[PDB]
Design a protein around this ligand. Structure first.
Ligand SMILES: CCCCCCCCN[C@@H]1C=C(CO)[C@@H](O)[C@H](O)[C@H]1O
Ligand SMILES: *[C@@H]1O[C@H](CO)[C@@H](O)[C@H](O)[C@H]1NC(C)=O
Ligand SMILES: [Zn+2]
Length: 1016
């Protein structure tokens, strides 16, 4: 029943990796269409029986923060554009306008009196104002996780369904810096029929236009059948502004932007201004414009022509509405009434355009090509590739992934019950979803906003994190307290969250210490949550006030623990070294938590006065010349010292890792008998060009290949434990840590680029894997796409988004690097992988930001590194454009994105405490996830509804029998189910009423949504 996503190479007309291999990329002057050619048309193509139908579609691009904050733009610009849109559309019935950004529309609509709300609904209802896409924002497509692209789409479309009674089926994405097939994937599963994109490489626009392949059915790279396909229109020219939307010649098009005559402080840089259309000039002006239109129409297959009309924060002034509308109405009246043009032009919406295109298709007038692949990495001109923003402001890129998971955890934990309105659960969840959704903006997560705007986004996300913690800790307290004893105050903190990796050590001493003592408090309850739908074990750590601490579960079974020191690293401006200080007042306890599917498990930490039986202590070795002592308060094991030397480590049965005398990995040995496979970590730096174009927040323009960071004689700390060992090294700008818990290691980098202007720090892996020019990166955490390094393209063009992982392989061996944050990366030579850590840029890169990137702050980046043998795996064939993770690599990714959550009970005694929740939840097959669980009704609703999004990835078969699991039916997760429906992914439309109230699982690479209904 399921399509095979590995063994059948789809046959498509345009496959982007194939196309890239053949294309030339030469940047030649095409004349007035600088990046194309002089377009020619046959004037007899259009006649009385076959007219060119032109839809002029007014629009206004509103960034939800960029050079101003969201609120500053809203106050200064967007409230005026929307207010005047309402008035001018109401007063002028044939005028049309499209609107994309629902965050702004919702901000506006709730400031409206009821009379204006009714006026607004009627212009939507009558088709004059039409929403396109309807997401909270127009998201970035490179760095964004698919889960947050769906979150934001849902947030906007749920608002529109509720308040406007509409759900867009056409998408408008004119500004993200390059485009991802994740978008048609999600849109086609959310009821969409059409989408439009703009920022694609100038060479690709040229290549597709030549073949009239700018409109295509965009299917996923593994889709043999074509059921994922979504009709897509790619705009043909450099910009979405009016000079680049009427036709190939911007000197002519600029004359039809009526806001550029002088009083608005805008002009035409091609030096010919617009002129008011009058009876005396209309024929001449019409001739000029129709000629542009007929040239643009040559690039497409039907007799229906899309002409966007708009630019940033347009349609603001009343006078601007008038100047655009009246001039265009004069042009339309003359053109439509002059038979010799054979054109019928009118204002239109995006849906009107698509509807007319498909009527032409149905009339047998055109057939469209099929296409798969992506549109990274974008260049708007010459060698200006937009790979910088895959890394810019990496602190916030990491914060995105943290908040992603905390939103999922808060919605899932609180979904199990209906809550009294006084608990304010819905209020806090809506704020969290909205601040996370806002940051998906293509100047948010991208790190392309001004410094004060980045501060706005961070403050909003911090409040979101606080709202998630409040919901989660209230939910835990209810789920784990005997019901007849449960006594909530909805404002109280029952638990606080403890997060080891955010903001992370060296970024903030945020972590509370559990304070225990014979004379104060003997013990403390802790609870772990597991948001994944399978049983999971994972080591968890806490800070405690004594090393003599032991762990039990709630059946009072001893649990094996390990105590280590708390080490922090310091730039000692006295000795000019970066070296570790051990706490004398705090220690770390580590143990394996075991947690049910989508469930909770409670443990207890108890103090004693001597070494507890089931707690071990790590040994610590500080490698450096000229050591000084390192006292550890009560820690029972003295630190040892040595000169720098190679070391090797092995935890459990896991691999054995060897390290250079500078504390960097050199090799991995998978098994006792197996070879020591060379795997070398190295840190290098890129600079900036001294003449020609400068790197900035968007552009990566290196002055040549990277050069090695000079390491000097760094201090190396080795901690060796039965449960966890690690090697940490203080390098310039980076504290680099390799952590071993018995499987693939975890890597943590505390990245502080300091005042190193015009530097980009890269972390590279050097191996002997014979990968050649092939490597794999992911798109939005959803799929892995095959990349080919091309020497015909400059270094920065071979950079791709690494939203969650990358790998290289040959016939026998693969190395996969999974990330806890989106960064930019590449494989610049056979056997290499590399990924940028941070970048500090003193110059602006001429894209409107008006600043470089000089606001860096310490960030803790996290990874997993998985070396595997793959000669037994069933892989796609050489011509297949996709790759797939193994089970180990997928679980390693899950450990970074969705770790166990840790809660510490906040008061002395928790009466009515329970050991576990969710013990009877089905433990689903490892490739299946419950991506979203969200209660969709408030408590007063008679019929409760709960939405689930189910996603199944596809894992390589490498011969692990690995079987027996339980079927997961989400519809029977809550009791008293009365109906089960399959829905669109936004939950807004029912697609199937399901027999037996049973939600079937989905196929590999498919994502489904279900809603269960419950009598209450
Ligand atoms: C290259 C021309 C400078 C831009 C003039 C006005 C802003 C155009 N539009 C803006 C531009 C950029 C980057 O170029 C994006 O970051 C914004 O999100 C976009 O709205
Ligand atoms: C919502 O739109 C539908 C179209 O499905 C229409 O029939 C209905 O009247 C609308 N509801 C309201 C409140 O107008
Ligand atoms: Zn924009």
């Amino acid at each position: 029943q399921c399509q095979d996503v590995v063994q059948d190479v789809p046959n498509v007309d345009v496959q982007m990796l194939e196309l890239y291999d053949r294309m030339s990329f030469k940047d030649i002057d095409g004349g007035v269409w600088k990046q194309g050619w002089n377009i020619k048309y046959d004037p007899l193509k259009y006649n009385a029986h076959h007219k060119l139908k032109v839809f002029v579609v007014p629009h206004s691009h509103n960034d939800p923060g960029w050079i101003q904050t969201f609120e500053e733009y809203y106050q200064h610009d967007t409230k005026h554009i929307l207010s005047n849109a309402l008035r001018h559309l109401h007063d002028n019935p044939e005028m049309k306008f499209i609107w994309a950004e629902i965050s702004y529309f919702a901000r506006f609509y709730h400031d409206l009196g009821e009379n204006k709300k009714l006026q607004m609904k009627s212009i939507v209802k009558n088709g004059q104002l039409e929403f396109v896409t309807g997401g909270w924002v127009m998201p970035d497509e490179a760095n964004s996780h698919w889960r947050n692209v769906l979150l934001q789409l849902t947030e906007g479309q749920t608002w529109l369904k509720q308040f406007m009674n509409v759900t867009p089926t056409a998408s408008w994405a004119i500004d993200p810096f390059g485009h991802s097939p994740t978008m048609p994937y999600i849109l086609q599963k959310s009821g969409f029929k059409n989408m439009l994109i703009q920022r694609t490489h100038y060479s690709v626009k040229k290549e597709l236009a030549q073949q009239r392949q700018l409109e295509f059915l965009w299917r996923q790279i593994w889709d043999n059948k074509g059921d994922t396909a979504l009709f897509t229109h790619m705009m043909p020219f450099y910009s979405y502004d009016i000079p680049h939307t009427c036709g190939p010649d911007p000197k002519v098009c600029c004359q039809f932007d009526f806001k550029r005559m002088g009083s608005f402080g805008l002009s035409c840089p091609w030096k010919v201004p617009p002129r008011t259309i009058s009876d005396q000039n209309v024929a001449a002006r019409s001739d000029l414009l129709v000629d542009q239109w007929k040239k643009k129409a040559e690039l497409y297959r039907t007799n229906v022509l899309l002409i966007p009309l708009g630019d940033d924060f347009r349609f603001k002034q009343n006078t601007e509405w008038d100047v655009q509308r009246v001039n265009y109405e004069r042009l339309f009246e003359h053109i439509n009434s002059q038979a010799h043009f054979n054109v019928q032009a009118q204002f239109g919406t995006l849906q009107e355009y698509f509807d007319a295109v498909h009527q032409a298709e149905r009339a047998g007038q055109a057939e469209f090509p099929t296409l798969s692949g992506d549109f990274f990495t974008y260049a708007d001109r010459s060698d200006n590739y937009w790979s910088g923003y895959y890394t810019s402001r990496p602190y916030h890129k990491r914060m995105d992934r943290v908040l992603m998971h905390y939103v999922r955890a808060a919605e899932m934990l609180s979904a199990w019950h209906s809550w009294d309105g006084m608990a304010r659960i819905e209020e806090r969840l809506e704020q969290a979803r909205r601040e996370l959704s806002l940051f998906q903006h293509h100047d948010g997560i991208t790190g392309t906003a001004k410094t004060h705007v980045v501060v706005d986004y961070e403050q909003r996300m911090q409040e979101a994190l606080k709202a998630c913690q409040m919901v989660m800790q209230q939910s835990v307290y209810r789920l784990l307290t005997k019901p007849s004893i449960y006594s909530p105050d909805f404002s109280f903190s029952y638990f606080t969250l403890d997060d080891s990796r955010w903001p992370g050590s060296g970024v903030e001493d945020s972590r509370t210490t559990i304070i225990l003592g014979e004379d104060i408090l003997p013990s403390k309850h802790v609870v772990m949550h597991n948001t994944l739908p399978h049983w999971r074990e994972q080591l968890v750590d806490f800070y405690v006030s004594s090393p003599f601490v032991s762990v039990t579960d709630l059946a009072n079974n001893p649990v094996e623990a390990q105590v280590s020191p708390v080490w922090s690293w310091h730039h000692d401006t006295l000795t000019k070294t970066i070296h570790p200080q051990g706490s004398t007042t705090k220690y770390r306890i580590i143990f394996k938590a075991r947690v049910p599917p989508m469930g909770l498990a409670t443990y207890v930490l108890t103090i004693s006065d001597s070494k507890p039986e089931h707690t071990s202590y790590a040994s610590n070795l500080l490698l450096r010349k000229n050591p000084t002592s390192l006292p550890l308060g009560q820690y029972p094991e003295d630190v040892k010292f040595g000169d720098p030397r190679e070391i090797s480590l092995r935890v459990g049965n896991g691999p054995t890792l060897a390290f250079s005398e500078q504390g960097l990995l050199k090799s991995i040995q998978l098994t006792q008998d197996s070879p020591h496979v060379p795997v070398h970590f190295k840190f290098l730096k890129y600079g900036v060009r001294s003449h020609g174009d400068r790197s900035g927040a968007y552009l990566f323009l290196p002055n040549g290949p990277a050069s090695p960071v000079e390491l000097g004689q760094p201090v190396v700390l080795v901690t060796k434990g039965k449960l966890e060992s690690s090697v940490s090294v203080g390098l310039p700008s980076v504290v680099h840590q390799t952590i071993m818990r018995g499987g693939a290691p975890e890597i943590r980098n505390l990245v502080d680029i300091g005042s190193l202007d015009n530097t980009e720090i890269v972390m590279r892996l050097e191996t002997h894997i014979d990968s050649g020019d092939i490597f794999y990166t992911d798109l939005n955490g959803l799929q892995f796409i095959k990349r080919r390094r091309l020497d015909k393209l400059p270094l920065q063009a071979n950079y791709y988004p690494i939203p969650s992982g990358m790998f290289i392989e040959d016939a026998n061996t693969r190395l996969t690097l999974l990330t806890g944050q989106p960064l930019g990366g590449s494989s610049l030579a056979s056997g290499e992988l590399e990924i940028m850590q941070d970048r500090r840029l003193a110059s602006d890169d001429e894209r409107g930001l008006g600043q470089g990137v000089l606001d860096n702050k310490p960030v803790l980046h996290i990874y997993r590194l998985v070396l595997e043998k793959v000669n037994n795996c069933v892989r796609p064939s050489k011509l297949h454009p996709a790759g797939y993770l193994t089970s180990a690599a997928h679980k390693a990714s899950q450990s970074l994105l969705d770790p166990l959550d840790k809660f510490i009970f906040a008061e002395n005694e928790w009466i009515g405490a329970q050991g576990q929740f969710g013990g009877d939840h089905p433990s689903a097959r490892e490739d299946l996830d419950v991506s979203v669980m969200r209660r969709l009704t408030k408590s007063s609703a008679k019929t409760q509804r709960v939405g689930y999004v189910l996603h199944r990835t596809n894992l390589m078969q490498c011969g692990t029998p690995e079987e027996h699991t339980q079927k997961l039916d989400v519809c029977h997760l809550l009791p008293n189910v009365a109906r089960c429906e399959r829905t669109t992914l936004t939950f807004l439309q029912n697609l199937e009423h399901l027999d037996g109230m049973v939600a079937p699982e989905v196929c590999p690479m498919e994502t489904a949504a279900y809603v269960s209904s419950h009598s209450s």
